[PDB]
Design a protein around this nucleic acid. Sequence first.
DNA 1: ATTATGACGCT
DNA 2: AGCGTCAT
Length: 430
Amino acid sequence: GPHMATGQDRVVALVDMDCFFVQVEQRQNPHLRNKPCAVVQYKSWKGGGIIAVSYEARAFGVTRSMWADDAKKLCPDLLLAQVRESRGKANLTKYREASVEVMEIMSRFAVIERASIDEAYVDLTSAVQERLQKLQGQPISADLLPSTYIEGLPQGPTVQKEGMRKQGLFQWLDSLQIDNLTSPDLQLTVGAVIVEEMRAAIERETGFQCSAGISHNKVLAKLACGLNKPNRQTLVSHGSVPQLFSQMPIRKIRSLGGKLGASVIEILGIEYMGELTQFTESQLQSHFGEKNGSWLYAMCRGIEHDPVKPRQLPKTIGCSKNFPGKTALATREQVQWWLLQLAQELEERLTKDRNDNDRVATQLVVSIRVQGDKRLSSLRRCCALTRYDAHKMSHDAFTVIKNCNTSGIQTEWSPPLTMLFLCATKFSAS
DNA sequence: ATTATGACGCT
DNA sequence: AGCGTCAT
Ligand SMILES: Nc1nc2c(ncn2[C@H]2C[C@H](O)[C@@H](COP(=O)(O)NP(=O)(O)OP(=O)(O)O)O2)c(=O)[nH]1
Ligand SMILES: [Mg+2]
Ligand SMILES: [Mg+2]
């Protein structure tokens, strides 16, 4: 009733760059613009593995995780850009620097949470309060929302997509009570006005296009962002949640796409997020644990409390390389050489991080995978990181992993190593 | 032989 | 601290 909190206290947006690495390469090379194109890492095995796909190429069925050779079967005119290689491995520096460009623009409008190389959450609650005081009860013109979809509208009592977008927006705006400065729907609308401005600034100052979601929490903002990619933003109101979730497969919600979501489906005998509402909070906790149960009980009603963290910089800086099948490292000299290449990249990135961001990592995490282990990491060991020196970190990494070598022979390495991973963590202000 | 990361929960 | 899960 009057006391049931509805999770409508915040305005949260999620901004995600469209086919980000592709856009970075299309900015640099105009010949790739407005074409089916993809970004690949490496080349010799099956043409390289695709990690980003322009929307024109997606129309042909090209996807992330495809081998380029297979993608070319679906799209013979597909254009390809390769990730830079340095010290024998993929080097993603160009895309990290482009990411910093975007995140610095977003930070002008609000404190952001860097959630990946291409996306950030924004808590717009206070900015919305401010813009509402400025508006002085003045209604919001559809011209301020030129790329916004309102999820669930139009409804009730008309052929092309832009016309449908405008019909839905008109219905939404006419239903608005622009007098109540505390109306959650009005707050979301003003948030969407601000996100239009943020996306305009990103495109004007970088050339990059993005999509966004606007809702009352992070999960709904992320889901909304996906609904109308590319180059559009979507508002998911609290009221839109029952219909949206009534046919939403459980796996589409962030964090339910793996074993937990499968167990929700299997234990409860349900398929859609909306079906979760029929269970009590205690029932869900009994199946999925305290925290998961409370999270599911709230989230199927559109309510989620995870805060937008004030964090524009990544928490860790890491370097990793797989050595699949027959390229796996089987000698001590090989393991040392690749530990050194990874450590040299790490030292470069860490030194630049220290100069830019006034902090120093203090812990070095070494992870390996051995042949025949189906897990990501076969072993993880930490040691101290006291100097940004690649020879030192690579010698320390060897010292912490050398006991994994089954070979009594000192020259060989058995079982051979199919992955090396160095990660700098536990940053302190310097 | 999907790869290269990054986040975060569990014990 | 080291491992597992999720993500893409
Ligand atoms: N190295 C590496 N990079 C990856 C991987 N997967 C993605 N990336 C990189 C390449 C991606 O460009 C970037 C951002 O990932 P998204 O937001 O998930 N995809 P995008 O922005 O391309 O398309 P959309 O319009 O649907 O958002 O992360 C991977 O497995 N490995
Ligand atoms: Mg993206
Ligand atoms: Mg993303």
